[model samples]
Target: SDLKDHRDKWNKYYGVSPDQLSKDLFDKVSPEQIKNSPYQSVGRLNVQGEAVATGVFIGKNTVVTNHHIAKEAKNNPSKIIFSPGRHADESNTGTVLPHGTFEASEIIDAPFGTGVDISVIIFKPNAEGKSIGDVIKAADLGNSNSLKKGDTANLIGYPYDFDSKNMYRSQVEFQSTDFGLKYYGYTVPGNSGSGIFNSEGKFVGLHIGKAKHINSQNEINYAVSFNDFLIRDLKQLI
Candidate 1:
């Protein structure tokens, strides 16, 4: 079976235990440091009682996530709700974190050539005065169109099945580039909307991809270059 081959490959890799590879390779700072920083809570999408992909807040009442995450709402826009500072368990009553539950005001769908499956949505702020929850400030969108190799980066997001005990943060340096920007890092599915920030906490990109290999253990991740964000005219939402 295909799963066997995938599992075998991982088993071999584990046996080899390549010294060059480190699970925490991209990390450059403490996870707590990033969590307490401007990086705020972004969560997985709950569609029809089933949680799907993830998303994050970029600006005041503005959220950015994959178009696919909100795909269901595209047909029935009213079904989407943006919950800020969310934890994993929906049943756990930590605090009734308030958030905007407005419909998508607009959709600049990502095109194929862009190599980005990203999208942005705007929602009206909570009437009871913006949710008391901590908000992630907008990291200065970096120059994705012209990123240099060996640049410093920090990745943040929430992954599926993993409790975001504020443990979803990574510090990585740019390794290389291909069609756009591709580098070695770690991320999870629910982390789609997590921000990729620079040394000064500026946004360099957005987490948007997950590993495909079945045996892959929560490793392998990707993001939409900041270039795509600008080309999409995301500033209008800010």
Candidate 2:
């Protein structure tokens, strides 16, 4: 599996001595190992020769992304490919894992009457009856109904094309509300579907938008409340 192979590669990369590591060697080892780490396992949504958005795993092989990310591809499933566990510069290096392509099965969103701006996707299976490698277990949904202001949270995802495999995880301080917990954190466009976990690493919610450019005092980022995940058990509408 790619994960095992990646771990081995990373072990080798990190085991090397600086004196033995050349410029070329560093380039080769870093890109492969760092890019394939567990931290990089995310869903990539592309369109028209450009990556439009990102998605993150919330459950076993199930991902949560923004409505806008998949909407374009929903109109044309062929254009969508579930490139999981890729590096930050993959778009430029053309680095893609094997069996990385997955046609979106269905898209679930609040606009569909769930009151959340999120969507759930099921990746198409490959000929071997498999999807991507190194699947992370779906995170448990947190208790959004019990949130309070000034709570601490963790954000895991590639921010603004920043390599998640190398960068520190994003953390936010929550401000409780009637709707749900709110917070201020940095998010890049590609980090859309990234998981927002509580200290215990449970799925707090799926991130939606960022207001970093405005209101420096409060760079608010919004997430689709996990309260809406209840819709997953309901009958399909379409």
Candidate 3:
């Protein structure tokens, strides 16, 4: 097949036994806290009730996530669901879906390639005429260009299986990368497409994943900085 060469190269470089997401990944904050500002803008993204991922509101009607999730949503556009402030009931059947579960209509930005892993989509309220952005305001933006090696980064996202019911925050030390930022943070698979913020709670960039780098300095978790054109160009889609 035409794709065999590419698949073989990728598998040779990245294919391996999966690493485990730590128990510490579930580090806690009250469910009520997740529904608050900054955190409120972070939520879950899903297609046809499966393969859950994290997403963020960057504009009034714009939701930003990873290109991987966006690729799937593109195939099943009508099944896209963005849930903000999502949490499960107390060992109960009820779901605290306050202001969550909006219909993501179109994927305005889903660029392919290595450095730019972000995707921006247009979302609307499922039944109501109102927009999801009207309530869960866009996250405060921060500058990644100015971030130093020892700066603190606060990442808000859903770990999918780890804690798909509610959002979790991971605070780690940040350092600049050639194309983005890196950290030894305790993030897992579902944490991709998250907005890594500063101590001030201002958005810095998009947290992609925790794939380890063997080239020496270990910044296990990687994030795409806002300094890139991908983010600048897509934010205007809203």
Candidate 4:
């Protein structure tokens, strides 16, 4: 009965309705839904030839992700590569559609380990001789400040343990914190730079780390809040 009560409480916290969890409320989105939504702009970020992070286009040629993913370069952008629409799974190898590869021309902002773990990259054109903006549209940024606990959100990225083979999406609920936003969901290492979007499909935050709890199997994800600092910086870039 103790376990049952725990389950009930957990369900209530993450549920959209009395009997439905947020996951049930926000179903695993289909590829068509992914392509049609602003999520289509999210992509994989490869650094030094390894798939190290995930990112999304926020402007004509600008991408945003976790700063730790690029902090080693010390502002050298050439060390990073961006691949839009990369899907990896057992049946299929990693594939970058429309635009093959985009090289980073500049590191707009990369602050590591701080409250803001973000990195904005300016990407060059792909092999097809087209800019990232030309091949895909930019994502619409949303206000994270407007979010509150119990709000529904989604995370889209390529987790490494899954072999970075296919892009994955997970539904989560907001748990406001003093430092950043806390969310409960299934997330792995490779999801470091994944974008957090609200139920309405508006960009909200940047997933950067997972809270560590002793002997706890529950996964709580952390993200840098898209507060005034982030918004002001992003506007300056645009």
**What ranking of all candidate models by lDDT puts the best one first?**
4, 3, 2, 1
lDDT of 2: 0.53
**Which lDDT value does model 1 have at 138?**
47
Clashing pairs in 4: 88-165, 88-166, 89-165
Per-model TM-score versus the true fold:
0.64, 0.64, 0.80, 0.79
lDDT of each: 0.53, 0.53, 0.70, 0.71
* lDDT by residue (tens digit), candidate 3, 48-147: 7556788888777788888877877555566778888787787746778877468777775555453477777787666767788676878876667778
| Model 3: colliding residue pairs | 83-101
Candidate 4 lDDT by residue in tens digits, 1-238: 6445434545554444422435443333345655666667888888885448788788778888887786755777888988877663334654435346798899856543355788778887776678887877888787788788777778887766644555667677766645678876666677888888887878888888776533265445789877766677686875
User: What is the lDDT, from 0 to 100, of the residue 55 in candidate 1?
Assistant: 60
Report the backbone clash tally of model 1: 0
Q: In model 3, which runs have C-alpha deviations exceeding 4 angstroms?
A: 1-26, 90-93, 109-115, 215-219, 228-231
lDDT of 3 at 201: 77
Off by over 4 Å in 4: 1-30, 49-51, 88-96, 109-113, 213-219
Which candidate has the highest lDDT of all? Answer: 4
